[PDB]
Amino acid sequence: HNLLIFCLKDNVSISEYTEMIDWAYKNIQSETVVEITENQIIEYQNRGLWRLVSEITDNWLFGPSEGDWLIDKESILAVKEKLQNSDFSTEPLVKNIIHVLEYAIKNEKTVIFHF
Ligand SMILES: [Mg+2]
């Protein structure tokens, strides 16, 4: 089951957590869902992406692992800034994560990391 970084869409309110995760795995087509494969995890670990995230969240110091993480507006903006200012800020995965963050800001959503 790939790592997800996501928020719900604008007109989706599902409050039960397990059900939100189920929604994300069922809506991988969504612009609000980033699916991240093992090979992406490794590629970006070795380039310092997760370390950049960890500067704000203090998690994933050694990359992602099984678990659930919830990112609030303050941290969403802070991570978004880190990524926009980074050396891979134009690479698709980073753009895709940025986009989830922007959407969550715009639509007042919590961002979930799930693996
Ligand atoms: Mg709305």
Compute CA 3 distance to the chain's CA centroid, rounded to the nearest angstrom.
9
Give the containing element (helix H, strand E) for 94.
Answer: helix 92-107
The domain made up of 1-115 has a fold known as: Hypothetical protein yfbM fold (3.40.1760)
Solved by what technique? Answer: X-ray
Candidates 66, 61, 52; CA nearest to 101 is 52
Ligand 1 centroid–CA 60 distance in Å is 30
Are 98 and 83 in contact by the 8 Å Cβ rule? The answer is yes
CA of 10 to the centre of ligand 1 (A): 5
Strand partners, 5: 34, 113
Centroid of ligand 1 to alpha carbon of 4 (angstroms): 22
**Separation of alpha carbons 7 and 103, rounded Å:** 8
- Residue ranges of the domains in the chain? 1-115
Q: Give residue 16 CA to ligand 1 midpoint distance, Å.
A: 18
Beta bridge partners of 95: none
Give the residue carrying structure tokens 């639509």. Answer: 107
How many whole angstroms from 85 Cα to the centroid of ligand 1?
28
